[PDB]
Every structure is written in structure tokens, then in C-alpha cells.
Design an enzyme around this catalytic site. Structure first.
Site, PDB file in Angstrom:
ATOM      1  N   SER A   1      33.500 -51.190 -13.946  1.00 31.26           N
ATOM      2  CA  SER A   1      33.651 -51.670 -15.321  1.00 31.26           C
ATOM      3  C   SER A   1      34.913 -52.501 -15.613  1.00 31.26           C
ATOM      4  O   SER A   1      35.011 -53.090 -16.684  1.00 31.26           O
ATOM      5  CB  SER A   1      33.540 -50.513 -16.305  1.00 31.26           C
ATOM      6  OG  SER A   1      32.195 -50.085 -16.402  1.00 31.26           O
TER       7      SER A   1
ATOM      8  N   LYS B   1      34.585 -56.069 -17.028  1.00 26.43           N
ATOM      9  CA  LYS B   1      34.247 -56.347 -18.428  1.00 26.43           C
ATOM     10  C   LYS B   1      35.371 -57.061 -19.184  1.00 26.43           C
ATOM     11  O   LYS B   1      35.120 -57.713 -20.204  1.00 26.43           O
ATOM     12  CB  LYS B   1      33.799 -55.093 -19.153  1.00 26.43           C
ATOM     13  CG  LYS B   1      32.522 -54.525 -18.569  1.00 26.43           C
ATOM     14  CD  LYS B   1      32.203 -53.154 -19.117  1.00 26.43           C
ATOM     15  CE  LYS B   1      30.993 -52.610 -18.384  1.00 26.43           C
ATOM     16  NZ  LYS B   1      30.623 -51.225 -18.784  1.00 26.43           N
TER      17      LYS B   1
ATOM     18  N   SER C   1      33.186 -49.215 -22.742  1.00 28.80           N
ATOM     19  CA  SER C   1      32.527 -49.540 -21.480  1.00 28.80           C
ATOM     20  C   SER C   1      31.000 -49.598 -21.631  1.00 28.80           C
ATOM     21  O   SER C   1      30.247 -49.255 -20.714  1.00 28.80           O
ATOM     22  CB  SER C   1      32.967 -48.587 -20.361  1.00 28.80           C
ATOM     23  OG  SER C   1      33.139 -49.309 -19.166  1.00 28.80           O
TER      24      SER C   1
ATOM     25  N   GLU D   1      24.869 -54.688 -14.950  1.00 24.56           N
ATOM     26  CA  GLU D   1      24.881 -53.243 -15.153  1.00 24.56           C
ATOM     27  C   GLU D   1      23.460 -52.738 -15.078  1.00 24.56           C
ATOM     28  O   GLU D   1      22.562 -53.376 -15.633  1.00 24.56           O
ATOM     29  CB  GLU D   1      25.491 -52.878 -16.507  1.00 24.56           C
ATOM     30  CG  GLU D   1      26.966 -53.193 -16.597  1.00 24.56           C
ATOM     31  CD  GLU D   1      27.813 -52.247 -15.775  1.00 24.56           C
ATOM     32  OE1 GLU D   1      27.260 -51.377 -15.063  1.00 24.56           O
ATOM     33  OE2 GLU D   1      29.048 -52.372 -15.860  1.00 24.56           O
TER      34      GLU D   1
ATOM     35  N   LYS E   1      41.639 -51.136 -18.833  1.00 24.90           N
ATOM     36  CA  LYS E   1      40.202 -50.995 -18.680  1.00 24.90           C
ATOM     37  C   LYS E   1      39.976 -50.240 -17.388  1.00 24.90           C
ATOM     38  O   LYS E   1      40.538 -50.591 -16.356  1.00 24.90           O
ATOM     39  CB  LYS E   1      39.497 -52.358 -18.627  1.00 24.90           C
ATOM     40  CG  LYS E   1      37.974 -52.293 -18.511  1.00 24.90           C
ATOM     41  CD  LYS E   1      37.336 -51.798 -19.802  1.00 24.90           C
ATOM     42  CE  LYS E   1      35.896 -51.343 -19.625  1.00 24.90           C
ATOM     43  NZ  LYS E   1      35.773 -50.028 -18.931  1.00 24.90           N
TER      44      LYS E   1
ATOM     45  N   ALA F   1      34.413 -46.638 -13.052  1.00 24.53           N
ATOM     46  CA  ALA F   1      33.951 -45.600 -12.144  1.00 24.53           C
ATOM     47  C   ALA F   1      32.700 -46.112 -11.445  1.00 24.53           C
ATOM     48  O   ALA F   1      31.834 -46.722 -12.070  1.00 24.53           O
ATOM     49  CB  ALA F   1      33.664 -44.309 -12.904  1.00 24.53           C
TER      50      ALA F   1
END
Length: 248
Positions: free
Chosen positions: A31, A34, A91, A127, A195, A198
Site C-alpha cells: 500500500s 498509494k 488504505s 488491488e 503510509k 502489508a
């Protein structure tokens, strides 16, 4: 715990590297991408090719796993700005995909990076697939130094306008889902804009602009992958690396 770990710390002003470990090895971004995504969106806004307020209407069919904000606005949609807030601060995965769609997808994020002088960082997937983190897979990876240098350019270079620079920093400052990481070892009164990420295969990472006196002065990027440790231990491991960088 078998983890491959990579990190770097930069002085935000000078851009001088203060410390690094495996800064040029590839790690799954997870993530953390992003922030780069919203960087590319803000660059399009700066260029008059996108508006912060543009409302995106999406359906149930756009929702992927973990969409805490987007799942609540199927009726009225969300603005580009709101999506970036959701992607960075929560997220939100659907928000990230919707934003990728606006810029033309992963190839365009990668092209954006190329055009700002990052020839290392690459997004290949959406994603949730980008979190697969298969060992030695170079898809959806960065290196600590590439990410840190890119973050620094985005946050302090003249790449984005003053307004967009600050907007990007503000979203990261408002990150709600990185509590057990750098935030857990930060002295009171310190500024942090971060930010976290995982992934599969015990992957964990964080990117941050942080500093004393309510102002950032350091870029910190820490990635790990291949960890056998539990989520709590992985959190502590990053936190401990962070506390060492902040302290030493």
C-alpha cells in the site's frame, strides 16, 4: 525472523542519505504505492488535466476487499480528492483502483515515475493482486532509495505545485492505519506523515516524512519481506528500526 529488510533515511533539506541497509534491493511496495498514485493524480491536477473535486460514480462491482470508505458511498460516489484521502489515510483498496483507473492504470503510474526520474519503482498490478509479494518477483516493487528519493521529490521538490505538495503531505499526515509502526515510537510533538503497507509472505513497509517541532526533516523508508514473524512482531520490528533511525 528470516526477513529481508531494507531501509533508508534521508535528510529532507539536503537530500543527504544518513543511513541505509540494502537500499537498492527490491521490495514489494504494498500500500505504500498509494502515495505515488496520489502524487501522479496531483501532477495531473497541476497540469489542468484533472480536478480535485471531480466526482467519480462507481458501483458495487468496483468494490474489492478492504474498502472501508468507498463501500459507504455507492449511492453518491466520491471526489478524486476524497478517493485520495481514502486511499492514503485508510488504505482503501477500491479508492486506489479507482484512482489508477483515472490515470490510466499501473503502466501510467510507472510512466509517471519514469518521467520524474524514478526508473526503478514499478507498479504492474491492481488491488489486491499487487500485495502478492512472491519472493524475487519484481512486479510492484521499489527499492528503499528509489522510494525515499521519489517521496522527497514529491514532497519537497518542484515536481508538484506548492498546493499539491502540501496536499500530499497533509493526506499522509492524516494516515489512520499506521499506528503500530513509526507512530508508536515517535516522541510527543513530532510531525509524521506516513503510509504503511502489508503484503503476503510476511511483507510490511512504511514510508514517512517526519521530524521534531511539528515539522518534517527526515524521510524514512523501511521495507521487509519473507518474515516468519506474527503481525505484532513485524510491527515492532519496523518500529524498532524506525526508533534506531530517529534516535541514532
Amino acid at each position: 525472523g528470516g526477513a529481508r529488510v531494507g531501509y533508508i533515511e534521508l535528510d529532507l533539506n539536503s537530500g543527504k542519505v544518513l543511513e541505509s541497509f540494502r537500499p537498492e534491493e527490491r521490495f514489494p511496495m504494498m500500500s505504500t504505492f498509494k502515495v505515488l498514485l496520489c502524487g501522479a493524480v496531483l501532477s495531473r491536477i497541476d497540469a489542468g488535466q484533472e480536478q480535485l473535486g471531480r466526482r467519480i460514480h462507481y458501483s458495487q462491482n468496483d468494490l474489492v476487499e478492504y474498502s472501508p470508505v468507498t463501500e459507504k458511498h455507492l449511492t453518491d460516489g466520491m471526489t478524486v480528492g476524497e478517493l485520495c484521502s481514502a486511499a492514503i489515510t485508510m488504505s482503501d483498496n477500491t479508492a486506489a483502483n479507482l484512482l489508477l483507473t483515472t490515470i490510466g492504470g499501473p503502466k501510467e503510474l510507472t510512466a509517471f515515475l519514469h518521467n520524474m526520474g524514478d526508473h526503478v519503482t514499478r507498479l504492474d498490478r491492481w488491488e489486491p493482486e499487487l500485495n502478492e509479494a512472491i519472493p524475487n518477483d519484481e512486479r510492484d516493487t521499489t527499492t528503499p532509495v528509489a522510494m525515499a528519493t521519489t517521496l522527497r521529490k514529491l514532497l519537497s521538490g518542484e515536481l508538484l505545485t506548492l498546493a499539491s505538495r502540501q496536499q500530499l503531505m497533509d493526506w499522509m499526515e492524516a494516515d489512520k492505519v499506521a499506528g503500530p509502526l513509526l507512530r508508536s515510537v515517535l516522541p510527543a510533538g513530532w510531525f509524521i506523515a506516513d503510509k504503511s503497507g502489508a503484503g503476503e509472505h510476511g511483507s510490511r513497509g512504511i514510508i514517512a516524512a517526519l521530524g521534531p517541532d511539528g515539522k518534517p526533516s527526515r524521510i524514512v523508508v523501511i521495507y521487509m519481506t519473507g518474515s516468519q514473524a506474527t503481525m505484532d512482531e513485524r510491527n515492532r520490528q519496523i518500529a524498532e528500526i524506525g526508533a534506531s533511525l530517529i534516535g541514532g
